[model samples]
Target: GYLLTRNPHLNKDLAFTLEERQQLNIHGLLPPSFNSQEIQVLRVVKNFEHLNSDFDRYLLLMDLQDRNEKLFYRVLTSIEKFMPIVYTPTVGLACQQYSLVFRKPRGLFITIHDRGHIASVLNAWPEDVIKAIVVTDGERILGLGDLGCNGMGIPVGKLALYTACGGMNPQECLPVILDVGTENEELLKDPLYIGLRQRRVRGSEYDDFLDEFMEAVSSKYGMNCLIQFEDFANVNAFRLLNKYRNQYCTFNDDIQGTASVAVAGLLAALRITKNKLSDQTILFQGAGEAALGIAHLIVMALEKEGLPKEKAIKKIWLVDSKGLIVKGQEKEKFAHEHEEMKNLEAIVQEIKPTALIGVAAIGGAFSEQILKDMAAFNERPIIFALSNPTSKAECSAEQCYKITKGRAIFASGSPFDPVTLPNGQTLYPGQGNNSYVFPGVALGVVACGLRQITDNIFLTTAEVIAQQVSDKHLEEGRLYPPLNTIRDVSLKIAEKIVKDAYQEKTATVYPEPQNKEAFVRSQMYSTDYDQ
Candidate 1:
């Protein structure tokens, strides 16, 4: 009974009935007020609105989640205003200041020293029926880069969305941090930093640690547990995704999830461009994990348009930190045959791409000249400022729309305010957030008991997201559905995946349901408090 009241998963707070309070021998233990879940939600929201600071609001929400699981999600799902605070952009700041902001530590932390004992660490977690796990090593967190164990904020925030937007049971989700160490020197010296205070361990040791973690996860939770890799550095993000994508029910949200959402935005933009994806020449600034992920997904999409894979690859040109990726480079196969160019403006001038994407975390990388050039080159150029934390965007929505005379099909990785042009046209910029891709994919994969997560599933997820954007949303200049409809969007995505999983003979959940939607919905987590 002591554990019953203390455990967040079972605690009802003031919502418990008098009879139950007496039966459980907890009468008079709680406050006299017998508040309903509705009342609790209202109190939470009222307190949330009064908070001036975003971090303070974040603190309030995290505290609520620590105390009351049902009410926390209820408050989160009640309105769209709280989404940004609990998830992205703000979550980035939360990760950066995690040590100082720490209250009660949530989620499992596995340091590099705990290599061989990963299974034991996993066994120590109270919940045994875990369906989804979002893990990160404090490297490449948002656009903030490495912050050591502080990266735990990302997985925690991500899984919060997995429940709020995707209808996944919060109890079945786990957030993990693999603290191999940090390359960030500032963190090493900071006394508040709560991680392995050493340089990053890499090569064989790092790989072996990861190998043990992956095997232990699958062995304990079975292959069906959705193990999502989040915020790993570019070097490991691609390598790990490639290595384990086929072997386990796993994915790197930064790679495939980001790609799916970005491609979804592109697919939606095509409706306005009135062109086939195969016909467009796309240029990417920053050929890192995200850029490569989007490139691969875009190639797959173009192939579906009857274009050869090689030709599709040719349509995409990438410029990394050094220069244009060209012949003889590691990525030479996808590179355009041209003299290496470093200046993005010069590259844009020579290539004349119909779309320009930024994932380099370079703030204002798309200068006024670049935006003007894009406007000059195409009637409706596609512009994606796909970087996290507003500070890292290539260009602001206002800047892009104003520069393009409201002709740019705009989407960003971070949320932006709607822009009103001089002609009285208000344009809503779509946010190409991985939240749109991962939640539904996670819910679907977990619901269907998928043994392996594939690129095709992500591709399918992208199409489903694009299809949800209506003509009305297009008229308002949105390339993705309103965040309000995300739950419905996730439901539809899970339904589609579940249907495909059964058709492809990939689902292990016994005896295919007669109604796939109902089956998926039946598995969805309800916010209603238990009786």
Candidate 2:
């Protein structure tokens, strides 16, 4: 029975029902006063909130995830209280102590020696549809730099949040490492170090192994299967990012992810300052922080404005405004360096922007970003926004929030949504959700694969999400309905993605859903076996 409840995915603890027990052939698995899922949540809340430290709280939460992922996610619904506990400061400790704290292996490791058989190694994972991968080489794990393969904690912690924060299916993402070994001498002597004992693999062979690794990865997972590069040594990180940038859809999180968040923060700041990402100089300091790369990404906005990368740097540098983008010219006169904007939805589907387009005054088409993926094709993103209109949507806002958390732009009436977004602000008679715009528009057509009538799910209860939050609730820093209600927003939003997917003939769920309500509810996960 301990083992029965041990199947974390299936473990409902005392929550298993009387009838459910016998059906599974264990009528009396244990003496039980059944715990309802809600009560269990209270128990978890009570236990953790009382715990003295986030470190211990982090451990308990990790254990809870292993025992019952459904309950684990529910706890995260109070994302505000726990996101820091689940990620950032807390997860960094998880990585540092990984070798001692390690339990079950949550990812795959491909070593410098694990070459020719790379594809064979990739096949070892139990999952089949890995849509995203967060891989690290351990050279740079957070600001701590090298912890060797113990950096494994970064991949696991991040992938955990992709689901915990983004609602991505846990099964659809994988955590991985390409262990070229590490240059950190201290790790070499430490018994805790988990990779090859050699002092870092370098030279052409380094490139070869990585090349094969990338080929095998995409060959199996297919492109668009996002591979995020985290914590690699800087010398090779950009080199590798550029190497595979066009080929396998791989990118570095520190450089590119940092850029997007900065871009997002600027989107909000622009909104606050009454300007936009296009006109800002955005001074960044230090070399390793990659101010140059950040500037390049920002240069993209100018490109969208009608310049090209060829001339975007001058304005971002705060230089001259002859600004038709003259060549060989170059500083605070603030000439927007390279680029020039307008068509969106095509870019919406085609570019699959990683969350930057919120400020658009077009009444929120619910499109969004300019993240790591755009490192390849992004010229400059046109995410000019305005007046808090439908703030939370595909690209509405903290998708920008990530770079600086809520404080950077949460300074005022920001859509705190995406620099331009995810899961954020809104509410009036009907204005809060930019999600309201396309969630229903796309749903109207895609639910039947019908053509675009484009009238536009989703607004029905600007009603309740609004009712759920009061001026009292809004008294503190919060600006929207509780994320507790955010899922309810999804019950409403998913009801439409299902419809929109179908309407574009893009939905292939088969002979039309028998129970549309249940069909809509079918995103999947849970446990606690009682009534």
Candidate 3:
């Protein structure tokens, strides 16, 4: 392995000392000059700075990761700079052009042809002791539609965060893309496309493949292995989560993770609103999985505030592509039967919602009048433009702040710069990212050896995250804590989760540690150079 200098996880590049190089029998195999890790980091950043396009910068970083893993993470974690590049909107673009941008292949790809021999494919992965896996069937790649095997970017990017933000070991992390095939014709026609060229297979065939894969995972890595389902379309997202969540140590990041983070932001917002969650009426722009996930979690939160489940759910309303999710259309009582008021602005006027959340993925969905109407209804309107790619955002942070005269407590799915009001008040917008939830949750579950995860765990995660928001953060109009402090935040959340696990007798790890924090920390990956 030492001779495999091209291997990212093992290579130190020029950072390997002279004595180590000689012992490894590679003394004359490299340049004579030895550079310190600090120097190497500076060089990497300098090269990164030279790249003009985000895609080029992304490629440069990917190339670095392919060659030197430790240095890549060291530079990435130096500040919260490269996350957006490696993930989210940039990642969305990377998937769209994956065939063109394809470099050294990373992670595991299981196709429909690999069906019954799923265990064989699991053994094919280089790493044996995998603790965390992010799996996506190339169906819905963010707001962007299916790109087939191109969706591999989502898992790769997410697992990177599991290591970077959550401190999971790089070797222990796995990214898997299941290619049932693509409904994407563009991808099927592309000569460079890497996945199966056939159309997507559904029904029993899909279910059988998933079952074999899940069984294979448990048989090889143990039932406690953390499997995070990501980016599945709404139809399959809710269905798969419900089917497997109780039986396996898995959770859908799109549903549960998104819910946890969004609820955390709302919990933090209550500090500025000076009100109970039960007191506020919430409205969602889209009634997809993301919106429904948040709504369900909000109900749980309201119940904790002493409101009945039925009453709590009633406080929230949803709007899909077709007007509202009504009682007859869907049995969910939160939906309103409204054919008269179709537009969001009209609905806002009729419903008088104090808080408005946008998950529609429709660009400019929240009209100017809708925002203004929100301000009119409440003194401190809670506005969350929770959509991906920035382009799909319902309203910009600048728009929310300016329209509300800087009184709107705003958070977004995408990152936004600080906005300056005419009065010279600069407000920092909070980003409600799933990174805040999944890392800590993964760390805690992995440490405790929990066989099955539950919705209660996510609710616990939200509470822990909300508790981290400082008076200082809230004063600056930030709903969530700064991204740089995520590691420490993850630690605290892990500690809380482990404590809960042990108390509830859900933890399978024997002889619970005296100090949960130290125990969880022990399981975390360290960047310190191995001797």
Best by TM-score: 3
- Which parts of model 1 are misplaced by more than 4 Å? 1-3, 328-330
Worst 10 residues of 2 by lDDT: 451-460
Taking the tens digit of each residue's C-alpha lDDT, what string does model 1 give over 1-531?
556788887788988888888899888788778988888888888898888988889989998899888888888888368878887778988998998888898899998899899999988898889999999997987767888999999889999999999989988999999999899888899999999989999899999999999999999998889999988887788789889988989999888888999999999999999989988999998888888889989999988889888778989999888988887433665766688889999999999999999998898999999999999999999999998678889999999999999999999998899999999989999889787888899999999899888888889899999999999999999999998889999999999999999998899998999999999999887888776
lDDT of 3 by residue, 249-330 (tens): 9999987899999999999999999989988999899888888889888998888879988778788889878786665523
Please identify model 3 stretches exceeding 4 Å from their true place. Answer: 1-4, 329-331, 336-340
RMSD of each: 1.7, 12.3, 1.6
Candidates by lDDT, descending order:
1, 3, 2
- lDDT of all predictions, in order shown? 0.90, 0.54, 0.88
Backbone collision tally, model 3: 0
- Candidate 2 lDDT, tens digit per residue, 194-220? 677777778899889988977888889
- Of candidates 3 and 2, the better by TM-score: 3
Q: 1 or 3, which is superior by lDDT?
A: 1
Once superposed on the true structure, which residue ranges of model 2 sit more than 4 Å away at CA?
Answer: 1-4, 276-279, 287-290, 307-311, 318-531
Query: TM-score order of candidates, best first?
Result: 3, 1, 2
Candidate 1 residue 22 Cα shift, in angstroms, is 3.9
Query: What are the per-model numbers of colliding residue pairs?
Result: 0, 70, 0
